[PDB]
Design a protein around this motif. Structure first.
Motif, PDB file in Angstrom:
ATOM      1  N   UNK A   1       3.814   0.429  -5.129  1.00  0.00           N
ATOM      2  CA  UNK A   1       2.677   0.569  -4.227  1.00  0.00           C
ATOM      3  C   UNK A   1       3.065   1.258  -2.926  1.00  0.00           C
ATOM      4  N   UNK A   2       4.294   1.041  -2.446  1.00  0.00           N
ATOM      5  CA  UNK A   2       4.738   1.731  -1.240  1.00  0.00           C
ATOM      6  C   UNK A   2       4.814   3.233  -1.458  1.00  0.00           C
ATOM      7  N   UNK A   3       5.168   3.667  -2.670  1.00  0.00           N
ATOM      8  CA  UNK A   3       5.247   5.098  -2.945  1.00  0.00           C
ATOM      9  C   UNK A   3       3.858   5.688  -3.173  1.00  0.00           C
ATOM     10  N   UNK A   4       2.976   4.943  -3.843  1.00  0.00           N
ATOM     11  CA  UNK A   4       1.617   5.424  -4.077  1.00  0.00           C
ATOM     12  C   UNK A   4       0.812   5.471  -2.782  1.00  0.00           C
ATOM     13  N   UNK A   5       1.043   4.520  -1.880  1.00  0.00           N
ATOM     14  CA  UNK A   5       0.266   4.380  -0.652  1.00  0.00           C
ATOM     15  C   UNK A   5       1.134   4.571   0.589  1.00  0.00           C
TER      16      UNK A   5
ATOM     17  N   UNK B   1       1.284   6.423   3.140  1.00  0.00           N
ATOM     18  CA  UNK B   1       0.712   6.695   4.452  1.00  0.00           C
ATOM     19  C   UNK B   1      -0.257   5.611   4.906  1.00  0.00           C
ATOM     20  N   UNK B   2      -0.237   4.447   4.261  1.00  0.00           N
ATOM     21  CA  UNK B   2      -1.150   3.359   4.599  1.00  0.00           C
ATOM     22  C   UNK B   2      -0.370   2.177   5.162  1.00  0.00           C
ATOM     23  N   UNK B   3      -0.247   2.046   6.489  1.00  0.00           N
ATOM     24  CA  UNK B   3       0.528   0.922   7.043  1.00  0.00           C
ATOM     25  C   UNK B   3      -0.003  -0.446   6.655  1.00  0.00           C
ATOM     26  N   UNK B   4      -1.322  -0.592   6.484  1.00  0.00           N
ATOM     27  CA  UNK B   4      -1.875  -1.878   6.067  1.00  0.00           C
ATOM     28  C   UNK B   4      -1.374  -2.273   4.683  1.00  0.00           C
ATOM     29  N   UNK B   5      -1.319  -1.317   3.753  1.00  0.00           N
ATOM     30  CA  UNK B   5      -0.760  -1.612   2.436  1.00  0.00           C
ATOM     31  C   UNK B   5       0.723  -1.940   2.534  1.00  0.00           C
TER      32      UNK B   5
END
Ligand code: PLP
Ligand code: PLP
Ligand code: PLP
Ligand code: PLP
Ligand code: PLP
Lengths: 267, 266, 267, 266, 266
Positions: E248-252, E254-258
């Motif tokens: 999920x960190x690689x997919x998202x 640019x999303x600090x909340x994720x």
């Protein structure tokens, strides 16, 4: 010539695996697995050097016991320069002497004058200059030194590539430049020219030192070696006969990846 | 064959070879008893001192010298300049001197002298150099000595080096000869041949700095087969007398009375 | 390709001698003596440097006068990296540009992007890496650097033996080792492989720098060169036509010692 | 304001600036189409070769040049010699060149050029030097090249250095620019301004070793805005022709036919 | 052709590749969303810690992993050990990683990867290494980073080196690229291909020290196409959760909340 007869004897080993054995039982396992020859040696020279010791020629009694147990040829080691150890080995009736840097050096400046013997010698080398100097002293067979006691193939690869690379360079070399090449190698010019004419070493050339897996053995053969030596690691395994057979098959079928998978799978 | 070339150079044993720059000097050298002459058009030291490259001499001047004498004629080629050697051979002279006195043409390789019919002489400073030149095909060896000085010290060094290592070979354990050949960076077969013969497999002359009759006899007493001498012979007021003095010193090198006679008033 | 057309054009120079000329009279003597091309240059760059000066492209006026005086191709020099000097030379209508270390270096880090030009370039080299880098920049012809202004052949011999020796090594090399070879040469791998497959440089290769006598010129041909450049020593002698013809004949008859004697005798 | 000074130097784009030692040379330079002249009384290399210190020129000779031409006049001050600059400004000339060609007056500091109304040109060898001179108040930058030799190699090095680091800035990660400014030892705000502009924030001329029309056009093709040339123009037999040739080479730097024409017979 | 292998590797963009030592780990990795798995029998750091040579894994354990999953399976060969690679290809896996994490088998040469049908991954620390591996036939590139530590500093260095030099190359004067290729000791044709493309001509992953979701997203924000992660995933309490967090960190990225959500309590 007597030398050519010795060279012809070693040529019978082409395509073969030579296995270190410490007793008659291991010798029989090696022969039954298809080894082309066995190397008799009584203790691991690395263990001898570990506890502060000098590694020498093995007891003739243990060598005789191995020679009586198998039909394939038997080799044994003499210290570098120790020509009397070689006289004893020849008098036992074995087939080859390995003048070996894995034993403790006995003469820092000179190797054995191998032309003084009827029995063929194998010597190690790390480059073409060493190979041709050992041949001029009378070696009928050459192996790489590789790296002893590690299972790491990197040094044997270096030595094979060095010897083979300089032989290839000698093929297209301007004849007029060969004199200086022999000077730089510190090797006899006549043997340099013979190597140039043949396109290969004038004796059989085996890999040794760090050959651990079937993949390693086939790698050496694909690089151009005529065979391989393997150490006692075969018998540290849980199934020595299977491990020995796997190396033999890897050398016989070195260009068949399917066979290499088969003999490596579950090893 | 190589043995034929070696036999040609053996005919010069006991002889003096003289540098000559023209036919007149060549005649003086022959009349004095020289065994051969070395044709060379200009002193290479003056060529270099004036910022120049010393090369093979003009074939025309070499031919003039060859036409003037019956004794053999030698001429110089630059080290590695195998085409200069091809030209010299085609002139019809008797020997080529592959000479460090001329400007080096190939820093890494000498001429492959086996490719020629004519015999070569090469220089050396030690046994390793001597045997390497022989393996390349030299049929005759000289010391390099020191060019352009008249100082014998380097020729003495080179003779003592070559002769000393030859003497070391006589009693050397056969088993140690392999390492000796490695250390010399010389071919083992030639090292063993030198050991069996007790001397170099080709004739061995002194060259470079041989200035007086005493120098020439010194080189013979140290074991050389003959000497080369330079243009200093023709710089004196009586060239015929000085050339004869060197010839006599080499022929009679163990006769101090002769050495006094040819040196007195020289 | 445009490059292949330039490379093909230079093949006409094989077997030829290229002569430095400082005026129209010398250019006519060179052509009448059988030169394959002339190199127009106004002053000796060594004497300019000895005068504490900067040696540059020659005046277009003197170059045009030489071009109008002969039918054979005319070359002229540009400083290394001075692409505007090369633009001017091209606009004069000469046949080749020599990007030359004999003139004063104008860019310490980069050579001219020679693919930007219609006119072919000749560049110097001292080893295979330099030769292949110049070719990749667009040189259609290569010469050794040799040693300028001395008449000493030793450096040209070194450069010829270096280039030819590495090509011979490359020809027989294990393909797997060529990647590291290209890395160590700092040369483009594709050109290294092309050179391996051809067994020689992909462009015409001449000797230059110190070629002084007929013997020197024939030596370069026997070492494998396609031709030679010679400097102004031809016109410092008392019979320039005779000396120029002697070099031309030496290159034509490089394997004939009798002819080499003939042209050298009395020279 | 600084932007006013920058705009003054921008008027010189496409131009050649010529060193002149008297009013006659200044007139020849202007008639040839020079964009400005550099007044200087004696060649600083001859001053140093005779064991001397090269300083600001006599205001009297500078005024004579200024009175002789309509185009702008520049004059040199020693690095750090802010009083020489005060004198030059009070003469009424148009630019001051804080010049390493004169003898260094302050080893550690340049002139604070923001203290002046007149624009300054400064030299540089790399982007760090260029931006430091700009921060001190230089309104125009030239390469240092190499003085007194006619050798273009150093000017090429300096142009390629400045231009190469400017090109490196274009695609550089913004986050890496802080460290880049540290390594340049240049002000970060000026580094960022250069990145946004894609070029130096002031006009950039070649100087030092520009000898031939080919050299001048080379500098323009490498991206310079103009060139300075030295006294070599007036050492020839036809100064008007040589000065015109440089002017034409800069105006027509991408026209090889023009470059041949002005070079032919020069 | 090479382009087929290159295109095949593009399927992994946006993905995480996970080291697995058995079929159960392989199934957890696939269920968590990994794009591929790296089969390896033991930790090469522990093999070297106990004084041992780290080699190709047993084909039996590799086959078991390949039969457990649908996503591609990679395995490691020692650098230069082309027979280990022949065996791996004959097993029928999808990629070979010629890996410096295993014991070097050839100090001077890598595998000639164009001799194989199967695509290879290779490591790099700079643009020269990346382009040399590509020219040898690598269809995919990863950083070497630092093995066995969980320290991201070396991977950051390698990513910034490769990306930084590509950005410089993109804007470089074409005439300077010849010297640039010389200094890189990389093939000029590939250097120019990279310049025109504006990025590495193969997929480029981060590897070596990627330990947390923050690390993985950092590599993606620096410009990588994906990441490799090691056995640290399975050396924790909830392996499926830790594997899903990296995916999920690689997919998202640019999303600090994720990134907070997947990191909280991890
Ligand atoms: C291989 C080896 C040599 C080789 O001897 P050379 O005369 O140099 O060819 C010497 N000493 C040792 C200890 C060696 O292992
Ligand atoms: C004598 C000499 C040599 C000898 O060559 P080796 O190959 O070292 O035996 C080489 N170069 C020069 C200049 C000499 O005078
Ligand atoms: C021959 C030569 C070069 C060659 O350039 P590389 O980029 O190293 O191949 C460079 N500089 C000078 C002065 C030369 O003579
Ligand atoms: C160009 C130059 C400088 C530049 O000064 P920095 O503060 O280093 O930018 C300094 N001193 C001398 C003599 C110069 O020529
Ligand atoms: C990465 C690496 C290399 C790279 O090889 P080059 O030919 O220098 O590009 C070589 N050796 C080792 C041990 C490495 O880790």
């Amino acid at each position: 010539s007597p030398f050519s007869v010795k060279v012809g004897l070693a040529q019978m080993l082409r395509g073969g695996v030579i296995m270190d054995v410490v007793n008659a039982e291991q010798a029989r396992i090696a022969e039954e697995a298809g080894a082309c020859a066995v190397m008799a040696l009584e203790r691991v020279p690395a263990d001898i050097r570990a506890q502060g010791g000098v590694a020498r020629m093995s007891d003739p009694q243990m060598i005789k016991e191995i020679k009586q147990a198998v039909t394939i040829p038997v080799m044994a080691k003499a210290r570098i320069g120790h020509f009397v150890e070689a006289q004893i080995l020849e008098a036992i009736g074995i087939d080859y002497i390995d003048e070996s840097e894995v034993l403790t050096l006995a003469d820092e400046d000179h190797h054995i004058n191998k032309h003084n013997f009827r029995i063929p010698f194998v010597c190690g080398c790390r480059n073409l200059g060493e190979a041709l100097r050992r041949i001029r002293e009378g070696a009928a067979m050459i192996r790489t030194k590789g790296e002893a006691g590690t299972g790491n193939i990197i040094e044997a690869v270096r030595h094979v590539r060095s010897v083979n690379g300089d032989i290839r360079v000698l093929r297209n070399m301007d004849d007029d430049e060969v004199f200086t090449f022999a000077k730089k190698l510190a090797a006899p010019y006549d043997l340099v020219m013979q190597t140039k004419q043949l396109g290969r070493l004038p004796v059989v050339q085996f890999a040794a030192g760090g050959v651990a897996t079937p993949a390693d053995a086939a790698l050496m053969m694909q690089l151009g070696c005529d065979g391989v030596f393997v150490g006692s690691g075969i018998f540290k395994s849980g199934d020595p006969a299977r491990r020995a057979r796997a190396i033999v098959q890897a050398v016989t079928h070195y260009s068949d990846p399917e066979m290499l998978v088969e003999v490596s799978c579950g090893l």
